[PDB]
């Protein structure tokens, strides 16, 4: 999934890959949560919360990744490079 | 521990949000693919 | 010919009469149509939706 | 002189005497002794009297005494009631409140009302106001209306589906329960068709307007009415020296929002000399705050003596039950939108159609309530006599009878083809009705109500919706489906002031679910619940706060209904893959007939009837789904299928087996698509 999003060249294709990827991440979080709700093992709760970090990270990546896909279709599109700068609003150096 | 359950419900909501927003960019892109560059002149 | 030219002159004058509200409206109609810009596309790629 | 109140044993209060003087001056009052004799002599009465004739307030009160006198010198027998129906909820309340004053007893105690979602009776109630549907709702449990002694079917002119059904059954009741009085009132002068229908019952005519009205016509026939109406408004504003507001009748929001704007332009041209004209739109889907303007008083006028005026531009909502005070100029272009449901193609239409010889009166009758007044019709007097038909069709000759046939079957009418309608429905419509019910398992092939059918009647819903909701309880989605039921049984919750269209549509997008308008409403309903039902959140997101508060009420009622028949409210897990899958399947269970597919030409055609349709542009879809489930086939400028939903054709064959049975189908594209799916599922 990570390689696909780095190499997919259309928004039409990307909306399948990322939507499938977020769906995949959800079931893994689900099954693991339902196990921890019965296991109670704190190391599994640690890794469950470690897994929630990774799932939440993928949502933030979405706006960065969507714009990056657009800056591979036509990276002359200076309107989308302004959006790229707005995605990195939290990082002056990356701007 | 309901804290994870409460966190999960927001994340699925937020996944659904990105589900639509992705689809918004698809229909946008389809129009752009129909137009090509003559539109800009 | 006197009947026809009287009618034709009248209809020439009647089109010329108040040639401004139509022109200003038709200019207004054109202006707002262009500025409205993007209509929604509503694409049909049903096999993608499948 | 101390009279005792017979109901509470009190001296009649000091307020009553003053009110008594004024009500003695109502026109109906002289007839008081005359009415009682007729009621004593006959079982059915037809009564007619113009607006302001006091019928609605005095007649039911006189009915009450007549009940009492019949109890005097008999034992105090089983508690019986006098009913007064009222076509609209707002009217049933506004009458009762006045009438609970007049009889100097506490509202809900001896004098009451019984409308939807609020019952104000007590065991001491003798006189019960109810909306028409509630007297239809009672009969379905108690066919002879067993609690009732004197019925009173007010405002008969409105001919609503509740009323047309009632009248027939009530004439059937007039057989059988041979003790019950009926007093059919009509406020329009109507050509005594009521008098025939009820076995030549005695007709009582009572006059009684408040002021006289002037009627006016254009001598030539203007060809663009809105240009005329707008031009008429300006002309009146400038030339009339009498103070007063202008009430202009247009067809709808596409025009009442245009007419406001263009009238504002010309008053901005007329500048300082002319008085200030304030233009107020008024149509049934304006949010509460926008409606409330109509109560606002006029400016204090400009200093030069130029009269400032309020101009209320309104659909037929100003014709009936809404009483706009201060109107002394009515402009009547002579049109209204009329639904007409074409039972051949299931196209329900909304075209601009000419009003009737009655409706023309009622529009004019707005003037003459506070002082004499003038009505200007933008049509010629010969046009009036010879194109406008004499009264507008009843509701029953106009609408889908699914809701009604099921009600009649529950009431134990088997003989629908002899049912005694005053103006019977078209043969072709009833054949859709039975066909609608027969697919839905409401009725078996010999036409008796089946077990599933009898439950479908119990819901305050249309037949399609009831089949959805019941079936939703076996798909484990009833809590989600219950809301999609509630939102579709109330007038649509989207607000779109055309001054703010782009911003309002942006709010609509944020709600939008991807799979269509039915999940978009469930998103809307949930969002309203999350925000503590705060009125403000309704406003900025352009959602009518009336609709949602009505909708949430409807939901609570349907929950109560489900419990009484042990339909468990359930949900699929939000975590589950099945959650949004189980919602869409339930829809398809019940609107399975009303499904479209996308033909190769780029248009939709509706399943079996080959009717050519387009997505109604309000839909929050951004794609044409290949198979589209839709709730309302609309004629305006084109056929438009509204409230469109993406469905997957596998559901159609599994969930709704009868109708999509391939062997019957008309040979065409619809059949070609369906066939391939069934082979795939096998």
Curated annotation (Swiss-Prot), chain B:
It is found in: Nucleus. Residues 1-41 form a coiled coil. Disruption phenotype: RNAi-mediated knockdown results in increased sensitivity to the heavy metal arsenite. Residues 1-41 have a biased composition (Basic and acidic residues). It comes from the Eukaryota. May be involved in pre-mRNA splicing. May confer protection against toxicity induced by heavy metals such as arsenite, possibly by negatively regulating the expression of phase II detoxification genes such as gcs-1 in intestinal cells. May be part of a spliceosome complex. Belongs to the SYF2 family. This is Pre-mRNA-splicing factor syf-2. The chain holds residues 19 to 59 of 234 of the full protein.
Swiss-Prot record, chain D:
Signal peptide: none annotated. Its main location: nucleus. Its EC number is 3.6.4.13. SUPFAM superfamilies: P-loop containing nucleoside triphosphate hydrolases. Residues 232-412 form the Helicase C-terminal domain. GO terms for molecular function: ATP binding; ATP hydrolysis activity; helicase activity; RNA binding; RNA helicase activity. Keywords: ATP-binding, Helicase, Hydrolase, mRNA processing, mRNA splicing, Nucleotide-binding, Nucleus. SMART domains: DEXDc, HA2, HELICc. It catalyses: ATP + H2O = ADP + phosphate + H(+). Belongs to the DEAD box helicase family. DEAH subfamily. DDX15/PRP43 sub-subfamily. This is Pre-mRNA-splicing factor ATP-dependent RNA helicase ddx-15. It comes from Caenorhabditis elegans. The lineage of its organism: Eukaryota, Metazoa, Ecdysozoa, Nematoda, Chromadorea. The gene is ddx-15.
């Amino acid at each position: 999934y990570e390689e696909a999003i780095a190499k997919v060249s259309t928004v039409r294709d990307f909306a399948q890959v990322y939507d499938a990827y977020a769906a995949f991440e959800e079931r893994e979080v689900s099954i693991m949560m339902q196990e921890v709700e019965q296991s109670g093992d704190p190391e599994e709760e640690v890794d469950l919360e470690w897994m929630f970090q990774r799932y939440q990270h993928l949502m933030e990546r979405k706006n960065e990744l969507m714009n990056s896909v657009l800056l591979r279709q036509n990276p002359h599109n200076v309107g989308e490079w302004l959006n790229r700068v707005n995605i990195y609003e939290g990082n002056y150096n990356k701007q | 521990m309901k804290d994870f359950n409460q966190r999960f419900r927001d994340l699925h909501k937020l996944r659904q949000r990105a589900r639509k927003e992705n689809h918004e960019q698809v229909v946008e892109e389809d129009r752009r693919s129909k137009l090509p560059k003559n539109h800009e002149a | 010919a006197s009947v026809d030219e009287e009618a034709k002159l009248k209809r020439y004058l009647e089109k010329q009469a108040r040639k401004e509200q139509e022109l200003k409206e038709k200019r207004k109609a054109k202006l707002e149509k262009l500025t409205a810009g993007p209509a929604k596309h509503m694409f049909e790629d049903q096999d993608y939706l499948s | 002189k101390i009279q005792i109140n017979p109901y509470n044993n009190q001296p009649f209060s000091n307020r009553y005497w003053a009110i008594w003087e004024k009500r003695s001056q109502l026109p109906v009052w002289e007839y008081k002794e005359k009415f009682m004799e007729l009621l004593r002599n006959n079982q059915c009465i037809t009564l007619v009297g113009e607006t302001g004739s006091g019928k609605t307030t005095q007649i039911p009160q006189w009915a009450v005494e007549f009940m009492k006198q019949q109890q005097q010198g008999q034992p105090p027998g089983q508690a019986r009631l006098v009913a007064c129906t009222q076509p609209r909820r707002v009217a049933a309340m506004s009458v009762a409140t006045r009438v609970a004053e007049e009889m100097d007893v506490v509202l809900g105690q001896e004098v009451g009302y019984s409308i939807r979602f609020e019952d104000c009776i007590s065991e001491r109630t003798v006189l019960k106001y109810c909306t028409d549907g509630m007297l239809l709702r009672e009969a379905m449990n108690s066919p002879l209306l067993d609690k009732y002694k004197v019925l009173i079917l007010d405002e008969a002119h409105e001919r609503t589906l509740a009323t047309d059904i009632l009248m027939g059954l009530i004439k059937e009741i007039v057989r059988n329960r041979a003790d019950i009085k009926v007093v059919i009132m009509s406020a329009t002068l109507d050509a005594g068709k009521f008098q025939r229908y009820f076995e030549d019952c005695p007709l009582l005519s009572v006059p009684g307007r408040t002021f006289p009205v002037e009627i006016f016509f254009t001598p030539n026939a203007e060809k663009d009415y809105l240009e005329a109406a707008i031009r008429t408004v300006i002309q009146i504003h400038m030339v009339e020296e009498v103070e007063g507001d202008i009430l202009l009748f247009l067809t709808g929001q596409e025009e009442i929002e245009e007419a406001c704007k263009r009238i504002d332009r010309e008053i901005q041209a007329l500048g300082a000399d002319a008085g200030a004209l304030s233009c107020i739109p008024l149509y049934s889907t304006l949010p509460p705050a926008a409606q409330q303007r109509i109560f606002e008083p006029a400016p204090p006028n400009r200093p030069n003596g130029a009269i400032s005026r309020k101009c209320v531009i309104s659909t037929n909502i100003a014709e009936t039950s809404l009483t706009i005070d201060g109107v002394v100029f009515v402009i009547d272009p002579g049109f209204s939108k009329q639904k007409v449901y074409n039972p051949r193609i299931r196209v329900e239409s909304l075209l601009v159609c000419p009003i009737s010889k009655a409706s023309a009166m009622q529009r004019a009758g707005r003037a003459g309530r506070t002082k004499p007044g003038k009505c200007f019709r933008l049509y010629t007097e010969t046009a009036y006599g010879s194109e406008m038909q004499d009264q507008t069709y009843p509701e029953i000759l106009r609408s889908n009878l699914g809701s009604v046939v099921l009600q009649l079957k529950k009431l134990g009418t088997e003989d629908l083809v002899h049912f005694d309608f005053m103006d019977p429905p078209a043969p072709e419509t009833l054949m859709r009705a039975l066909e609608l019910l027969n697919y839905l398992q409401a009725i078996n092939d010999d036409g008796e109500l089946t077990e599933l059918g009898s439950l479908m009647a119990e819901f305050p819903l249309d037949p399609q919706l009831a089949k959805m909701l019941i079936t939703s309880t076996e798909l484990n989605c009833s809590n989600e489906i219950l809301s999609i039921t509630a939102m579709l049984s109330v007038p649509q919750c989207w607000v779109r002031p055309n001054e703010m269209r782009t911003e309002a549509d942006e709010a609509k997008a944020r709600f939008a679910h991807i799979d269509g308008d039915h999940l978009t409403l469930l998103n809307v309903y949930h969002s309203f619940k999350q925000n503590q039902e705060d009125p403000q959140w309704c406003y900025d997101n352009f959602i009518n706060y009336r609709t949602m508060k009505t909708a949430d009420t409807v939901r609570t009622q349907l929950s109560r209904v489900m419990d009484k028949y042990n339909l468990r409210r359930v949900s699929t897990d939000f975590k589950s893959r099945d959650y949004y899958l189980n919602i869409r399947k339930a829809l398809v269970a019940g609107f399975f007939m009303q499904v479209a597919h996308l033909e190769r030409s780029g248009h939709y055609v509706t399943v079996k009837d080959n009717q050519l349709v387009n997505l109604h542009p309000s839909t929050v879809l951004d794609h044409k789904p290949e198979w589209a489930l839709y709730n309302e086939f609309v004629l305006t400028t084109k056929n438009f299928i509204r409230t469109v939903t993406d469905v997957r054709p596998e559901w159609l064959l599994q969930i709704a087996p009868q109708y999509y049975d391939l062997d019957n189908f008309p040979d065409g594209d619809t059949k070609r698509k369906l066939t391939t799916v069934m082979q795939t599922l096998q």
